Amino acid sequence: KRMEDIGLEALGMNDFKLAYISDTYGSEIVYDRKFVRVANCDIEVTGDKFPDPMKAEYEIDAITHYDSIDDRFYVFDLLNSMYGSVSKWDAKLAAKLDCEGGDEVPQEILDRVIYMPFDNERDMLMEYINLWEQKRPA
Amino acid sequence: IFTGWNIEGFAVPYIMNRVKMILGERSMKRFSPIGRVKSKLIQNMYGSKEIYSIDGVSILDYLDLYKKF
Amino acid sequence: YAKMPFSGVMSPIKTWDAIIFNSLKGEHKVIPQQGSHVKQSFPGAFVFEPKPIARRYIMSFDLTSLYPS
DNA sequence: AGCTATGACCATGATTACGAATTGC
DNA sequence: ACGAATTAAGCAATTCGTAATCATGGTCATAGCT
Ligand SMILES: Cc1cn([C@H]2CC[C@@H](COP(=O)(O)OP(=O)(O)OP(=O)(O)O)O2)c(=O)[nH]c1=O
């Protein structure tokens, strides 16, 4: 700021992040995909009208979260809600054919699914927060 | 006070740019007593008005001075 | 490759800046300060005027990566 | 009582300028 | 027209729709002659 106020050019990186990056490694970087934690997530909320992320006035009903280091899906289900209370979800029925009441979900994907149902939204959100702390995605 | 007819429209932007692209940035700032000159772009009346501000001297373009007074 | 944070890939400005800075530092040089300019439009590529009639036999040519070349 | 030339109209056709959505080098 | 603190790939091109404006065909109305 002082050099700008005097009016002389201040040479070098104004952003220190990549400056420290270059000073730290210098040589080329050898990486590994399996060591970097990449996570995917998907959200479903049941409500009378379209829920607004700017408000989030409706509860969250379906949580799914895939992690790459453990290549594992975590599924959170709420058994009861003000918009409707429902039973659990069975993996076997999902793998069945549509004509037989199934959902055609592949079995190999089902092999990597871990289920944790919760009765109320608060417990589900606590579990999601604590797993996020335990499993911090890159 | 540095004035002239339509000075902020042609004279200043032209002198500044020519000195910048012929002599360099350091020579261009020599005009400012405190070596501090800045360039802004105004998109009014088909834009293209690179109003130059020199810190230490006052630009008082005579065209608008006569227009409003 | 550019020794830059992950998100910066969404902006080519940052990745090109980082890689050029790395190349310059590797040879013990110094990059200039971010100056200041104004947005301008300059002429783009050229395209001919085809006669909208059926053309039986056509040959096609191109130059590999025109602008870097 | 009917054919027909012509004015009004009502919409129709046509041209221009501008905003917008989409390619493609 | 001075707000004043600040920020992130580019241009050339077609095609359609809308809004504004001028020229006009089909048809209706007037009417005039037979
Ligand atoms: C696509 C694209 C291209 N360009 C410029 C860059 C130079 C030319 C053609 O190079 P392209 O990469 O199209 O040629 P390429 O496909 O690499 O060459 P071939 O035609 O495969 O020989 O156009 C650009 O500015 N932005 C773009 O998004």
Contact C30, A11 (CB under 8 A): yes
CA atoms of C55 and B50, how far apart (whole Å): 49
Coil, helix or strand at residue C38: coil
CA atoms of A39 and A68, how far apart (whole Å): 6
B52: left (phi over 0), alpha (psi -120 to 50) or beta: beta
Question: Judging by DSSP bridges, how do beta strands A72-78 and A113-118 pair with one another?
Answer: parallel
Atom number of ligand 1 nearest to Cα C45: 23
**Does an H or E element contain A65, and which?**
strand A62-67
Asked whether residue C45's C-beta has any atom of DNA/RNA strand D within 7 A, the reply is yes
- Residue A72, strand partner residues: A67
The chain C residues in contact with chain A (CB within 8 A) are 1-6, 18, 21-22, 25, 30-34
Chain B nearest-CA distance from A6, in A, is 7
Coil, helix or strand at residue C58: coil
Tell me which residue has its CA closest to atom 1 in ligand 1: C65
Q: Is the CB of C62 under 6 A from ligand 1?
A: yes
Tokens 């002389």 -> residue: A8
- Using CB atoms within 10 A of its CB, is residue A73 exposed (0-12), middle (13-18) or buried (19+)? middle
CA atoms of A122 and B12, how far apart (whole Å): 65
Q: How many residues does chain B have?
A: 69
Is A44 marked as binding a ligand? yes
Angle subtended at Cα A118 by Cα A93 and Cα A57, rounded to the nearest 5 degrees? 110
Query: Any idea which nucleotide's C1' is nearest the CA of B42?
Result: E1
Resolution given for this structure, in angstroms: 3.7
Asked whether residue C50's C-beta has any atom of DNA/RNA strand D within 7 A, the reply is no
Preceding-residue numbers of gaps in chain C (C–N over 2.5 Å)? none
Angle subtended at Cα A18 by Cα A13 and Cα A22, rounded to the nearest 5 degrees? 100
For residue C36, the Cα-to-chain-centroid distance in whole angstroms is 20
Count Cβ atoms below 10 Å from residue C40 Cβ, excluding itself: 8
